Design an enzyme around this catalytic site. Structure first.
Site, short mmCIF file in Angstrom:
data_model
loop_
_atom_site.label_atom_id
_atom_site.label_comp_id
_atom_site.label_asym_id
_atom_site.label_seq_id
_atom_site.Cartn_x
_atom_site.Cartn_y
_atom_site.Cartn_z
N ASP A 1 0.82 -1.21 0.00
CA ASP A 1 0.00 0.00 0.00
C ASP A 1 0.85 1.26 0.00
OD1 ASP A 1 -1.95 1.90 0.19
OD2 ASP A 1 -2.92 1.04 1.96
N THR A 2 1.05 1.86 -1.19
CA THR A 2 1.85 3.07 -1.25
C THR A 2 1.14 4.26 -0.62
OG1 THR A 2 1.03 3.58 -3.48
CG2 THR A 2 3.04 2.27 -3.34
N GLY A 3 -0.17 4.17 -0.42
CA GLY A 3 -0.90 5.27 0.21
C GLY A 3 -0.92 5.21 1.72
C1 LIG Z 1 -6.74 6.91 2.59
C2 LIG Z 1 -5.22 6.88 2.53
C3 LIG Z 1 -4.69 8.29 2.59
C4 LIG Z 1 -4.64 6.06 3.67
N1 LIG Z 1 -5.02 4.69 3.81
C5 LIG Z 1 -4.40 3.79 2.90
C6 LIG Z 1 -5.23 3.38 1.69
O1 LIG Z 1 -4.40 2.68 0.79
C7 LIG Z 1 -6.47 2.49 2.08
C8 LIG Z 1 -6.09 1.06 2.53
C9 LIG Z 1 -7.28 0.25 2.82
C10 LIG Z 1 -7.74 -0.76 1.96
C11 LIG Z 1 -8.91 -1.48 2.24
C12 LIG Z 1 -9.64 -1.20 3.41
C13 LIG Z 1 -9.19 -0.19 4.26
C14 LIG Z 1 -8.03 0.52 3.98
N2 LIG Z 1 -7.32 2.45 0.97
C15 LIG Z 1 -8.51 3.06 0.86
O2 LIG Z 1 -9.05 3.78 1.70
O3 LIG Z 1 -9.16 2.81 -0.34
C16 LIG Z 1 -10.50 3.20 -0.55
C17 LIG Z 1 -10.72 3.71 -1.97
O4 LIG Z 1 -10.72 2.54 -2.81
C18 LIG Z 1 -11.35 1.48 -2.08
O5 LIG Z 1 -10.53 0.32 -2.19
C19 LIG Z 1 -10.00 -0.04 -0.90
C20 LIG Z 1 -10.84 0.71 0.14
C21 LIG Z 1 -11.38 1.93 -0.59
S1 LIG Z 1 -5.52 4.18 5.31
O6 LIG Z 1 -5.70 2.77 5.26
O7 LIG Z 1 -6.60 4.99 5.71
C22 LIG Z 1 -4.19 4.50 6.41
C23 LIG Z 1 -4.17 5.67 7.15
C24 LIG Z 1 -3.16 6.01 8.00
C25 LIG Z 1 -2.06 5.21 8.18
B1 LIG Z 1 -0.96 5.66 9.13
O8 LIG Z 1 0.09 4.86 9.22
O9 LIG Z 1 -0.98 6.83 9.83
C26 LIG Z 1 -2.02 4.00 7.43
C27 LIG Z 1 -3.07 3.68 6.58
#
Ligand SMILES: [C][C]([C])[C]N([C][C]([O])[C]([C]C1=[C][C]=[C][C]=[C]1)[N]C(=O)O[C]1[C]O[C]2O[C][C][C]12)S(=O)(=O)C1=[C][C]=C([B]([O])=O)[C]=[C]1
Ligand SMILES: [Cl-]
Ligand SMILES: [Cl-]
EC number: 3.4.23.16
Lengths: 99, 99
Positions: free
Chosen positions: A25-27
Site C-alpha cells: 500500500d503506497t498510500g
Molecule cells: C486513505 C489513505 C490516505 C490512507 N489509507 C491507505 C489506503 O491505501 C487504504 C487502505 C485500505 C484498503 C482497504 C480497506 C481499508 C483501507 N485504501 C482506501 O481507503 O481505499 C479506498 C478507496 O478505494 C477502495 O478500495 C480499498 C478501500 C477503498 S488508510 O488505510 O486509511 C491508512 C491511514 C493512515 C495510516 B498511518 O500509518 O498513519 C495508514 C493507513
C-alpha cells in the site's frame, strides 16, 4: 518482481510467527495489521483514513518477511479491515512505483 | 518515473482545468477526490476505509491528467482526507510496483 495493478497487490507476509495476507500500500505511511500478539513494549496511537480514526497499538522494531524479503520497522496493530504494508516497510524491501 | 517511497508519493493532477495534489495509492481500488464540481450525472457508491464507510458520488468517463499522463475514467467525490489515485487510474498510466 514486477506487480501489475489490475487486482489488489496482495502478498503473503510472516509476522510474529504467523502467516498473513497483506496489501502492498503506497498510500499508507505505516504498516497496520489486524489483531494479533507481538512481543515487547507498545504504546497507543490513533490513525485516520477514509471513514475516520481507529485506535491501534504501536510496536517498534518488529521483523517482517514480505514476499521473501526481510525488513524491520514499526507495526500498528488494531481493527483494520485489511492488513496493510505501508511505506515504512516498503522502502526497506526497495519497492518503487514505476510508470 | 521511478518513485521511491521514503516520502508520500504525491503528484499533481489536473481535473476540470484545475491543478490538485493527489497520492498515488496502490491500496485503493478506486480514485477518490475531495468535494468539487464535475459534469454529468453521478451514481451512488459506498466505500470502506480504515475507519469505516463513507458515501461518495461516482462520476464516470472523467478526463484527468496524472503527473502529466492522460487518463479518462471513474472519479469518486466525497469526504476523503486526501485526494487518492487508485488502481482504476494507476493501470491507465501503466504503473507497476517493483522490488
Ligand atoms: C486513505 C489513505 C490516505 C490512507 N489509507 C491507505 C489506503 O491505501 C487504504 C487502505 C485500505 C484498503 C482497504 C480497506 C481499508 C483501507 N485504501 C482506501 O481507503 O481505499 C479506498 C478507496 O478505494 C477502495 O478500495 C480499498 C478501500 C477503498 S488508510 O488505510 O486509511 C491508512 C491511514 C493512515 C495510516 B498511518 O500509518 O498513519 C495508514 C493507513
Ligand atoms: Cl518504521
Ligand atoms: Cl446517495
Amino acid at each position: 518482481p514486477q506487480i501489475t495493478l489490475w487486482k489488489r497487490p496482495l502478498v503473503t507476509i510472516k509476522i510474529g510467527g504467523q502467516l498473513k495476507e497483506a496489501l502492498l500500500d503506497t498510500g499508507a505511511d505505516d504498516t497496520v495489521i489486524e489483531e494479533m500478539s507481538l512481543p515487547g513494549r507498545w504504546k497507543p496511537k490513533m490513525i485516520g483514513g477514509i471513514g475516520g480514526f481507529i485506535k491501534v497499538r504501536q510496536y517498534d522494531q518488529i521483523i517482517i518477511e514480505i514476499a521473501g524479503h526481510k525488513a524491520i520497522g514499526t507495526v500498528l496493530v488494531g481493527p483494520t479491515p485489511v492488513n496493510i504494508i505501508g511505506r515504512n516497510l516498503l522502502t526497506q524491501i526497495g519497492a518503487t512505483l514505476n510508470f
